[PDB]
Write a protein that binds this ligand. Structure first.
Ligand code: 6G0
Length: 181
């Protein structure tokens, strides 16, 4: 068995790509790349696509649970929010790619103990103004799920206590931090 079986993941995941094209609506600029559900198929895809730091400003990658679209309007996102990492321009070089890869692993390895079921996906925004990485969760009112997710994530990224990160509800973004760790 071990010698020939690919290792299945807890969830099947979909990677999405966004390219800013002004000719198009935001939703129309969103595009599913591929899905995977094994460790081996994760790395085949990751080793095949551009690093986040190599994307033209305006692009996103999103990794979401199969069946959850990477938009606020999805039933599993409507009432949720995100843990936001705000990077300066100098961190595109030093931290963006390692932070994103760490975030990908937090999701596919189900790293938030029981609250991993609260995770919906992650988004990296490559922006000239400053990049962003975020983990999206399904319910911004689940205090103990959100907070545990936030504390684990912060430690897995290696962020020091001199840093505080904030959690924002999608209902507030679509128009303020609810929690900070
Ligand atoms: C996630 N999302 C983004 N948009 C649209 O895209 C625009 C830009 O949002 P981004 O999340 O790409 O973030 P950016 O850095 O590009 O722009 P910022 O708003 O943060 O500017 P700032 O850095 O504060 O000066 C939004 O204002 C919406 O019009 C969405 N539209 C829908 N319908 N659903 C979505 O889920 C969705």
């Amino acid at each position: 068995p071990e010698h020939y079986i690919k290792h299945p993941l807890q969830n099947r995941w979909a990677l999405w790509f966004f390219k800013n094209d002004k000719s198009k609506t935001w939703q129309a600029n969103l595009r599913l790349i591929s899905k995977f559900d094994t460790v081996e198929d994760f790395w085949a895809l990751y080793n095949h696509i551009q690093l986040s730091s190599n994307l033209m400003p305006g692009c996103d990658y999103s990794l979401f649970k199969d069946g959850i679209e990477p938009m606020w309007e999805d039933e599993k996102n409507k009432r949720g929010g995100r843990w936001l990492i705000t990077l300066n321009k100098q961190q595109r070089r030093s931290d963006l790619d390692r932070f994103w890869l760490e975030t990908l692993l937090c999701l596919i390895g189900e790293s938030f103990d029981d609250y991993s079921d609260d995770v919906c996906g992650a988004v990296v925004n490559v922006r000239a103004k400053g990049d962003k990485i975020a983990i999206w969760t399904t319910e911004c009112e689940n205090r103990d799920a959100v907070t545990h997710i936030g504390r684990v994530y912060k430690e897995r990224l290696g962020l020091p206590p001199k840093i505080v990160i904030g959690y924002q509800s999608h209902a507030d973004t679509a128009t303020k931090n609810r929690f900070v760790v």
